[PDB]
Write a protein that binds this ligand. Structure first.
Ligand code: ZN
Length: 302
């Protein structure tokens, strides 16, 4: 049987890769081919961030640069910005003999009351990623802020606008337009702060984590390179969660080994049945035919 199966377009007749390569674009094809190689090799440099509106793809920041951005924006001491108005209560920490600091934690309310804090939002100021990542596994969500002129403002959108357990929510830099922090009040779903709600309440275009790979497929009649911009449905594993998980990070590697394990014969590889949409693409200034994999997922049992 095939290692991949189509989730749609099962009515189509399979096209040989040699026939696909001469045709013009766009079209759509059903294929049954083998995976020779793929890119990238390490299945942590494949995860990217794509704006849904402007369609730009860019890299996921490694945790070191977030601490860089944190300390650069995190100021020294606030004055009036503390336990203020009808939004948050905020008692601050201190630090002695650990080189000194005053990290600030701000607890946003729920129609005046403070609810089951597994639905509670935090406005940390002056903290570090590891400290934040430990405050995100128990609390609902924490978003980094810094003391602006007279109002707490989010950091640069190169930093995540929302930390929610094992998911780091990023927005688009030029597509989004940061609004005031006070707009978190006008949030209808006051119990659960859905990431899109706080993004809309602040004017942020949320980027989604995606698997960005490139497959080299060969059915025997020809060799063809196919793209893959999977959210969650190809590996049946959600791409915004692989980077902070071991078993999620353990299965995608196992899946690609089930597809092509380097060491055995090629005719011992399992067949891959996918659906592809070809289309015309420019690179620098040269039109090219690109192939993307759609409506395809892993087979029954690994
Ligand atoms: Zn954008």
């Amino acid at each position: 049987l095939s290692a991949t199966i189509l989730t749609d377009h099962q009515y189509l007749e399979r096209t040989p890769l040699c026939a696909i390569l001469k045709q013009k674009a766009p079209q759509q094809y059903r294929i049954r081919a083998k995976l020779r190689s793929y890119k990238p090799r390490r299945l942590f440099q494949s995860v990217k961030l794509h704006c849904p509106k402007c369609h730009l793809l860019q890299e996921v920041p490694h945790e070191g640069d977030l601490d860089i951005i944190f300390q650069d924006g995190a100021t020294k001491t606030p004055d009036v910005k503390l336990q203020n108005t009808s939004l948050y209560d905020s008692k601050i920490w201190t630090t002695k003999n650990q080189k000194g600091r005053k990290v600030a934690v701000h607890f946003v309310k729920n129609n005046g009351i403070l609810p089951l804090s597994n639905e509670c939002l935090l406005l940390i100021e002056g903290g570090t990623l590891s400290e934040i990542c430990k405050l995100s596994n128990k609390f609902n969500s924490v978003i980094p802020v810094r003391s602006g002129h007279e109002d707490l403002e989010l950091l640069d959108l190169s930093a995540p606008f929302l930390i929610q357990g094992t998911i780091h929510h990023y927005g688009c830099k030029q597509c989004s337009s940061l609004r005031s922090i006070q707009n978190l009040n006008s949030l209808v779903d006051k119990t659960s702060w859905i990431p899109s709600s706080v993004a809309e309440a602040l004017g942020i275009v949320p980027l989604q984590y995606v698997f960005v790979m490139t497959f080299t497929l060969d059915d025997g009649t020809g060799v063809l390179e196919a793209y893959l911009m999977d959210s969650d449905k190809f590996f049946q594993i959600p791409a915004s969660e692989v980077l902070m998980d071991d078993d999620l990070q353990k299965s995608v590697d196992m899946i690609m080994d089930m597809f092509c394990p380097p060491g055995i014969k090629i005719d011992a590889y399992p067949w891959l049945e996918c659906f592809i949409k070809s289309y015309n693409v420019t690179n620098g200034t040269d039109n090219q035919i690109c192939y993307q994999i759609f409506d395809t997922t892993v087979a029954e049992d690994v």
